[PDB]
């Protein structure tokens, strides 16, 4: 499972 706080700039729902 990715840690979404690795890079706050990354939105996982975004393509």
């Amino acid at each position: 499972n990715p840690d979404p706080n690795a890079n706050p700039n990354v939105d996982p729902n975004a393509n």
Epitope: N1, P2, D3, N5, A6, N7, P8, N9, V10, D11, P12, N13, A14, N15
Partner: antibody, heavy 120, light 114 residues
Framework: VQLVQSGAEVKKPGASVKVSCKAS????????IHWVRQAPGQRLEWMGW????????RYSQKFQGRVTITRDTSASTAYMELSSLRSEDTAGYYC??????????????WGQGTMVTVSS | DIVMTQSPDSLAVSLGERASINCKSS????????????LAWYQQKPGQPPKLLIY???TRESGVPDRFSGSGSGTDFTLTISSLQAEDVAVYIC?????????FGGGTKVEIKR
């Protein structure tokens, strides 16, 4: 969108350096600013990031002791401080907006980077 | 830490020839939920910051020429330059953003044979 960094410097071993990074062209509080170092003949090393809004940070273990990243939102600028400098730390240093994958857009901006030489 | 391993270290092909760069992840970085690989590909010319080329392992960053493309899942990934131009001489770096800390590949140097 642009990040302009501070000038090259030499620092004596065991001393401290603090590189600046000014942001322009967007809402400074909206994005996280990263710092990555590149030492000659060595891969890119991520050092840490700071959310420019609430000033929350996250650091790397390899530098966790001696690194300090801060932002002055009034001046739209982020700062990174290495302490207890050694010879390993002679390297180029970058502030970066790494892989901002937003819904609307996707972009990746880096400063011109700043070289720090640790020497007597 | 997730370790990014690239092969080869160096490459040289003729102008117009195909170049292929493998990056292997030391831990799977595909998220089965959204079916997204959390990998980026970069290019670095001398005296310049790295420029981003691919993200989500296969999405070209806008502006980037079509001769660059990315592929692979899980732990194994390739960057493909279909027809090397003389300006493509650079170091290429894969990058994972699955986990802290963010890590980079060692970089592959493409050269021109002429």
């Amino acid at each position: 969108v642009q990040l302009v960094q501070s000038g090259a410097e030499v620092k004596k071993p065991g001393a401290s350096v603090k590189v600046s990074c000014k942001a322009s062209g967007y809402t400074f509080t909206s994005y996280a600013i990263h710092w990555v170092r590149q030492a000659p003949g060595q891969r890119l090393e991520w050092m840490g990031w700071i959310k420019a809004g609430n000033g929350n940070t996250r650091y790397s273990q390899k530098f966790q002791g001696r690194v300090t990243i801060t932002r002055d939102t009034s001046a739209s600028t982020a700062y990174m401080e290495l302490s207890s400098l050694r010879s390993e730390d002679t390297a180029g240093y970058y502030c970066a907006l790494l892989t901002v994958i937003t819904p609307d857009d996707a972009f990746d901006i880096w400063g011109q980077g700043t070289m720090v030489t640790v020497s007597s | 830490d997730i370790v990014m391993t690239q092969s080869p270290d160096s490459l040289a092909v003729s102008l117009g020839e195909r170049a292929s760069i493998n990056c292997k992840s030391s831990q799977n970085i595909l998220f089965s939920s959204n079916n997204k690989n959390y990998l980026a590909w970069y290019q670095q010319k001398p005296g310049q910051p790295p420029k981003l080329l691919i993200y989500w392992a296969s999405t070209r960053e806008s502006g980037v020429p079509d001769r660059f493309s990315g592929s692979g899942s899980g732990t194994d990934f390739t960057l493909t330059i279909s027809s090397l131009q003389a300006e493509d001489v650079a170091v290429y770096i894969c990058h994972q953003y699955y986990s802290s800390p963010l890590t980079f590949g060692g970089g592959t140097k493409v050269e021109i044979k002429r």
